[PDB]
Design an enzyme around this catalytic site. Structure first.
Site, PDB file in Angstrom:
ATOM      1  N   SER A   1       0.579  -0.826  -0.252  1.00  0.00           N
ATOM      2  CA  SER A   1       0.664   0.341   0.151  1.00  0.00           C
ATOM      3  C   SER A   1       1.221   1.368   0.741  1.00  0.00           C
ATOM      4  O   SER A   1       0.377   2.546  -0.800  1.00  0.00           O
ATOM      5  CB  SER A   1      -0.759  -0.164   1.267  1.00  0.00           C
TER       6      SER A   1
ATOM      7  N   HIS B   1      -4.600  -5.972  -1.600  1.00  0.00           N
ATOM      8  CA  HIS B   1      -4.911  -4.281  -2.298  1.00  0.00           C
ATOM      9  C   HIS B   1      -4.638  -5.227  -4.030  1.00  0.00           C
ATOM     10  O   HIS B   1      -5.285  -3.908  -4.542  1.00  0.00           O
ATOM     11  CB  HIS B   1      -3.765  -3.890  -1.950  1.00  0.00           C
TER      12      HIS B   1
ATOM     13  N   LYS C   1     -11.461  -3.758   0.624  1.00  0.00           N
ATOM     14  CA  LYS C   1     -10.834  -3.006  -0.180  1.00  0.00           C
ATOM     15  C   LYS C   1     -10.915  -2.738  -1.914  1.00  0.00           C
ATOM     16  O   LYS C   1     -11.691  -1.725  -1.988  1.00  0.00           O
ATOM     17  CB  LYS C   1      -8.828  -3.776  -0.496  1.00  0.00           C
TER      18      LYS C   1
HETATM   19  C1  LIG Z   1       6.293  14.773  11.000  1.00  0.00           C
HETATM   20  C2  LIG Z   1       4.843  14.489  11.889  1.00  0.00           C
HETATM   21  C3  LIG Z   1       4.160  13.286  11.116  1.00  0.00           C
HETATM   22  C4  LIG Z   1       3.397  12.903  11.961  1.00  0.00           C
HETATM   23  C5  LIG Z   1       2.351  11.305  10.962  1.00  0.00           C
HETATM   24  C6  LIG Z   1       1.540  10.864  11.751  1.00  0.00           C
HETATM   25  C7  LIG Z   1       0.826   9.403  10.924  1.00  0.00           C
HETATM   26  O1  LIG Z   1       1.371   9.694  10.007  1.00  0.00           O
HETATM   27  C8  LIG Z   1      -0.380   8.943  11.683  1.00  0.00           C
HETATM   28  C9  LIG Z   1      -1.146   7.677  10.549  1.00  0.00           C
HETATM   29  C10 LIG Z   1      -2.615   7.516  11.752  1.00  0.00           C
HETATM   30  C11 LIG Z   1      -3.351   6.390  10.882  1.00  0.00           C
HETATM   31  C12 LIG Z   1      -2.606   4.897  10.554  1.00  0.00           C
HETATM   32  C13 LIG Z   1      -3.246   4.481   8.791  1.00  0.00           C
HETATM   33  C14 LIG Z   1      -1.971   3.080   8.415  1.00  0.00           C
HETATM   34  C15 LIG Z   1      -2.405   2.219   7.744  1.00  0.00           C
HETATM   35  C16 LIG Z   1      -1.992   1.391   7.025  1.00  0.00           C
HETATM   36  C17 LIG Z   1      -2.071   0.835   6.171  1.00  0.00           C
HETATM   37  O2  LIG Z   1      -1.207   0.243   5.097  1.00  0.00           O
HETATM   38  C18 LIG Z   1      -3.837   0.060   6.004  1.00  0.00           C
HETATM   39  O3  LIG Z   1      -2.600  -1.565   6.837  1.00  0.00           O
HETATM   40  C19 LIG Z   1      -4.691  -0.791   5.431  1.00  0.00           C
HETATM   41  C20 LIG Z   1      -6.246  -0.430   5.935  1.00  0.00           C
HETATM   42  O4  LIG Z   1      -6.292  -0.829   7.245  1.00  0.00           O
HETATM   43  N1  LIG Z   1      -4.487  -2.351   5.151  1.00  0.00           N
HETATM   44  C21 LIG Z   1      -5.524  -3.676   4.792  1.00  0.00           C
HETATM   45  C22 LIG Z   1      -4.852  -4.494   4.717  1.00  0.00           C
HETATM   46  C23 LIG Z   1      -5.090  -5.373   5.656  1.00  0.00           C
HETATM   47  C24 LIG Z   1      -6.278  -5.495   6.520  1.00  0.00           C
HETATM   48  O5  LIG Z   1      -7.389  -5.068   6.263  1.00  0.00           O
HETATM   49  P1  LIG Z   1      -8.628  -5.649   6.611  1.00  0.00           P
HETATM   50  O6  LIG Z   1      -8.436  -6.362   7.620  1.00  0.00           O
HETATM   51  O7  LIG Z   1     -10.568  -4.754   5.742  1.00  0.00           O
HETATM   52  O8  LIG Z   1      -9.003  -3.788   7.713  1.00  0.00           O
HETATM   53  C25 LIG Z   1      -4.463  -6.563   5.875  1.00  0.00           C
HETATM   54  N2  LIG Z   1      -3.160  -6.552   5.004  1.00  0.00           N
HETATM   55  C26 LIG Z   1      -2.939  -5.703   4.369  1.00  0.00           C
HETATM   56  C27 LIG Z   1      -1.826  -5.769   3.030  1.00  0.00           C
HETATM   57  C28 LIG Z   1      -4.251  -4.188   4.163  1.00  0.00           C
HETATM   58  O9  LIG Z   1      -3.363  -3.536   2.945  1.00  0.00           O
HETATM   59  C29 LIG Z   1      -4.397  -0.185   3.765  1.00  0.00           C
HETATM   60  O10 LIG Z   1      -4.029  -0.992   2.649  1.00  0.00           O
HETATM   61  O11 LIG Z   1      -4.444   0.466   3.580  1.00  0.00           O
END
Ligand SMILES: CCCCCCC(=O)CCCCCC/C=C/C[C@@H](O)[C@H](O)[C@](CO)(NCc1c(COP(=O)(O)O)cnc(C)c1O)C(=O)O
Lengths: 492, 49, 423
Positions: free
Chosen positions: A267, A295, A327
């Site tokens: 991702s 994804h 997704k």
């Molecule tokens: C200088 C100061 C900067 C401050 C920055 C702070 C910051 O960035 C904090 C971020 C807040 C939220 C973070 C969210 C992270 C998301 C990562 C993403 O890869 C997710 O893992 C997702 C969606 O959840 N993964 C989905 C997915 C799963 C699980 O799917 P579900 O069971 O349906 O929830 C499992 N494996 C994989 C590979 C994926 O993708 C995503 O991909 O979006």
């Protein structure tokens, strides 16, 4: 490793000056965080952060201060970009409830106004199945009226249901594997089914940029974990050779099983895995393969079967095929597909099967309707046009971005488009400026990316028409000129 | 149009040196420290000439 | 040191074991139960209509028409899927409304929502406890607590079930070790993880002595109420309302919304100071998609129903007492639980040596009862994974829906079947 069609990807290296400036900015922020912490220690300014109760002051401190330092002085400043509430269907256009803060993002107060018709790039909905109208909604409504919302027991107990049987059979037909099993949450799928397969005395070769769920699942089991470089087949081959030859570390006994965890589309990084080479290595060195297609289940493929159809390979070569319905299909859940023996063993010995609640009936109905729409069993021609439109949108968007001069990561066919910012303040600035100009974007920082590499992600969809992309591209070009985000030297 | 030009230059300054995230009094403190250091270096250089 | 030719010979001679071992055991768990239609009162199991004495639906809110209507309205407004994590455009207004409703219902400053019942207490523990801390956990804790403790690297001590002298003994040993090494002592944190109403045994923990021990030996209490959240107390607040313990003393309360509220997902309530950490350090929260709005609206409407009518707790309590008193007197079985407990266990009085034979006998009882139109289930465990393996048992679940006559007839049916089989 034979590729039917050329495999192109580009990961442009960071400029030196930009890296220096990133380090300078992070150092300045860290120093001022130290100063704020010192001021709060002397009580010169009241600490809006809550403190533990009076009678618990004698207890050992619950939180080490330096552990939360990043949250207290770095994350809190630009917290407004993330956790933005919405109040409509997350389609192409979404409505965002406006909010403002008076104490520099410490506490948020919702104002009356709501922003309407924001162009949405955060939500996934690749095939555009997130609509409140259609045949899927009506079928879900009927199943909700009949069965009801939620189930109250685990699958091994009376919580099993016939809708689950239908969903599992449909998934098995859709993927091409012999059997499959469904699950409440993909994160739960990984964390509860990695430990079942492998035990102590086995090796797990995990990719460098693996999802958090995969890492947690590997840790829960006792298997030894070794990490190879991201999409570097030489590193994987070297690790396989050394592991097979030398054996277990304490006592040089041969490994019981060797398991390789890879993902379809990363991702954050945006790169498609080099599947044919991985399969060649797996066959040569007698390993097992665990492919996470979260994804890439619907985004990639001539008919949306996955990455396996994208590369033209045989579905039977992959030992374990995990996927997530969230997704693309527009409903929460997860699944694992494989041979019959694997599915029987998982039904008998999975944590989710025994100690966890089953999947909701309306959700499984919506998943079934989406799958029968894609597979063409619906009778509508909407199945193919969605995939073709997604492909055209991805290609057009990536070409237009590259012509401007932004640094872009990943394979060209990858729908997820990461754009590179590289600086701390620009993370907040880009989000605020984009939201002001009526486009919603997602930016990611240090918790999920390396410190130097800070990126804004775009998730294309088949819902987007050309005009939406045109307006988005014009606004992105203007904002990039405003903040000087064009770092690419090759083509600008 | 010059005023917009210097405003944009200051905005680029703020973005580059991460002052954009900081509160106004922190910005004032940093600017005062920087200009003090620059003036000290200027006089020390004039010592050499 | 190895020559090349030896290296290729070693590589080619190696043969990995099969991915999944063969299963020549004919597991009963392999044969599932096919339930046609909703799993409600008067359901159909394996083609035979039966009264549901197995599903964890205490308040009978699964088939309440108001809940279905509210869920349908939310479905029309938003759709099935949320399409995002909580951070990235995945937070709806229904989520914040549900969090507010839970906080006001539990009279607590803040509450957080997890999209999956296991994940909430699987991820709450590793967030606060790190390597080097010491955690005292009850022996009969559910599998979710055990996995949460294993995910963190903290040291784990298991004290005996509902034995407070054992906990005091462990704390005294810990304090003498504390006096041994003060520099390590200032860093190590003490936690006591206890379950409100135990799933495995169906008993109730002695909270007041836990509070006394916490304030004497300085250990933070984590309370898990998966069953006691919606069945105990005058207003169904929990075990804290049942005992009368001030909610301030308990540091964190975890629960799942599937059992009582009949909706998928869980939650954790506490002060803002401890809760706010989970929004960033919770693996199940940050890296997973949010709960669908349909389920959240169903939960909110269930909360409204619970707030409006507080007599359902009283009738549930009286039905539990009735059935528990009626079941006493079976020749070959023993009741394991407390009168106030909604879900309890029936175990063999004198068990044969082999566990498989006991499981077979219990399965025969269950099938014979199902032919008699009373649906029962058997407690399912993982033999290898469970740290402390409970004995095999038949689960009995009490519901407000079931009438007095149905309870009497179920008691008589189980009595006759047990005398027929265990003889
Ligand atoms: C200088 C100061 C900067 C401050 C920055 C702070 C910051 O960035 C904090 C971020 C807040 C939220 C973070 C969210 C992270 C998301 C990562 C993403 O890869 C997710 O893992 C997702 C969606 O959840 N993964 C989905 C997915 C799963 C699980 O799917 P579900 O069971 O349906 O929830 C499992 N494996 C994989 C590979 C994926 O993708 C995503 O991909 O979006």
């Amino acid at each position: 490793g034979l590729y039917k069609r050329p495999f192109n990807e580009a990961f442009e290296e960071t400029p030196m000056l930009v890296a220096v400036l990133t380090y300078v900015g992070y150092g300045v922020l860290t120093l001022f965080g130290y100063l704020r912490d010192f001021l709060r220690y002397w009580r010169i300014e009241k600490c809006h952060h809550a403190t533990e109760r009076e009678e618990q002051k004698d207890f050992v401190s619950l939180y080490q201060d330096f552990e939360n330092f990043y949250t207290r002085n770095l994350y809190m400043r630009i917290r407004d970009n993330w956790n933005r509430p919405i109040c409509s269907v997350p389609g192409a256009r979404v409505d965002i409830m406006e909010r403002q803060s008076h104490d520099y993002n410490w506490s948020f107060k919702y104002t009356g106004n709501i922003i309407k018709g924001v162009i949405n790039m955060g939500s996934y909905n690749y095939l555009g199945f997130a609509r409140n109208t259609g045949s899927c909604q009506e079928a879900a409504a009927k199943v909700l009226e009949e069965y009801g919302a939620g189930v109250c027991s685990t699958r091994q107990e009376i919580g099993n249901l016939d809708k689950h049987e239908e969903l599992e059979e449909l998934v098995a037909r859709f993927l091409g594997v012999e059997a499959a099993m469904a699950y409440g949450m993909g994160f739960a799928t990984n964390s509860m089914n990695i430990p079942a397969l492998v035990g102590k005395g086995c090796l797990i070769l995990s990719d460098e940029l693996n999802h958090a769920s995969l890492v947690l699942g590997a840790r829960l089991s006792g298997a030894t974990i070794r990490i190879f470089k991201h999409n570097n087949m030489q590193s994987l081959e070297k690790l396989l050779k050394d592991a097979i030859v030398y054996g277990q570390p304490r006592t040089r006994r041969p490994w019981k099983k060797i398991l390789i965890l890879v993902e379809g589309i990363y991702s954050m990084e945006g790169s498609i895995v080099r599947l044919p080479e991985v399969i060649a290595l797996k066959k040569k060195y007698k390993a097992y393969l665990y492919l996470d297609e979260a994804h890439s289940i619907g985004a990639l493929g001539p008919t949306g079967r996955g990455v396996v159809e994208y590369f033209g390979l045989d579905p039977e070569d992959v030992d374990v095929m995990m996927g997530t319905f969230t997704k693309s299909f527009g409903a929460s859940g997860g699944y694992i597909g494989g041979k019959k023996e694997l599915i029987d063993y998982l039904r008998t010995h999975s944590h989710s099967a025994v100690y966890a609640t089953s999947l909701s009936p309306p959700v499984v109905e919506q998943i079934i309707t989406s799958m029968k729409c894609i597979m063409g069993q619906d009778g509508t021609s909407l199945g193919k046009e969605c995939v073709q439109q997604l492909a055209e949108n991805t290609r057009y968007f990536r070409r237009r971005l590259k012509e401007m001069g932004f640094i872009i990561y990943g394979n060209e066919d990858s729908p997820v488009v990461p754009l590179m910012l590289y600086m701390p303040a620009k993370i907040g600035a880009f989000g605020r400026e984009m939201l002001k100009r009526n486009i919603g974007v997602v930016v990611v920082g240090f918790p999920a990316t390396p410190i130097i590499e800070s990126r804004a992600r775009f998730c294309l969809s088949a819902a987007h028409t050309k005009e939406i992309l045109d307006t988005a591209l014009k606004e992105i070009d203007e904002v990039g000129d405003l903040l000087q985000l064009k770092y690419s030297r090759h083509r600008l | 149009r010059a005023w917009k030009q210097m405003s944009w230059f200051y905005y680029q300054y703020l973005l580059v040196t991460a002052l954009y995230m900081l509160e106004p009094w922190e910005r004032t403190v940093f600017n005062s420290m920087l200009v003090s250091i620059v003036g000290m270096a200027l006089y020390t250089g004039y010592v050499f000439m | 040191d190895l020559t090349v030719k030896e290296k290729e010979e070693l590589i080619e001679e190696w043969q990995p074991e099969p991915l999944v071992p063969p299963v020549p055991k004919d597991h009963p768990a392999l044969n599932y139960n096919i339930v046609s239609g909703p799993p409600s009162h008067k359901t159909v199991v394996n083609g035979k209509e039966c009264i549901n004495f197995a599903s964890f639906n205490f308040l009978g809110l699964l088939d309440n028409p108001r809940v279905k209507a509210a869920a349908l309205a939310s479905l029309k407004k938003y759709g099935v899927g949320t399409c995002g994590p909580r951070g990235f455009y995945g937070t709806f207004d229904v989520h914040l409304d549900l969090e507010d409703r839970l906080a006001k219902f539990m009279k607590t400053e803040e509450a957080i929502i997890y999209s999956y019942g296991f994940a909430t207490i699987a991820s709450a523990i590793p967030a606060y406890s790190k390597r080097g801390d010491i955690v005292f956990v009850d022996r009969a804790a559910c599998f979710a607590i055990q996995k949460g403790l294993q995910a963190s690297r903290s040291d784990i001590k298991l004290f005996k079930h509902n034995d407070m002298a054992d906990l005091e003994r462990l704390l005294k040993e810990q304090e003498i070790e504390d006096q041994k090494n003060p520099r390590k002592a200032r860093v190590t944190r003490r936690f006591i993880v206890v379950e409100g109403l135990y799933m495995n045994t169906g008993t109730i923990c002695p909270l007041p002595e836990l509070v006394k021990l916490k304030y004497k030996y300085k250990a933070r209490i984590f309370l898990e109420e998966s069953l006691s959240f919606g069945v105990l107390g005058e207003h169904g607040r929990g075990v804290t309302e049942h005992y009368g313990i001030n909610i301030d003393d308990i540091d964190l309360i975890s629960a799942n919304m599937e059992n009582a509220l009949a909706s998928i997902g869980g939650f954790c309530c506490g002060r803002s100071f401890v809760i706010d950490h989970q929004r960033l350090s919770g693996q199940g929260y940050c890296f997973s998609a949010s709960l669908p709005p349909l389920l959240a609206a169903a939960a909110i409407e269930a909360l409204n129903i619970m707030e409006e009518n507080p007599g359902i707790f009283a009738v549930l309590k009286e039905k539990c007492g009735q059935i528990h008193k009626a079941l006493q007197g079976i020749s070959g079985l023993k009741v394991v639980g407390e009168s106030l407990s909604p879900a309890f266990h029936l175990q063999l009085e004198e068990s044969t040596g082999s566990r498989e034979q006991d499981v077979r006998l219990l399965q025969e009882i269950v099938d014979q009862c199902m032919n008699r139109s009373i649906a029962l289930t058997q407690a399912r465990y993982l033999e290898k994974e469970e740290k402390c393996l409970p004995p095999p048992s038949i689960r009995v679940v009490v519901t407000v829906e079931q009438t007095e006559e149905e309870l009497e007839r179920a008691a008589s049916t189980i009595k006759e079947v047990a005398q027929a089989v265990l003889l």
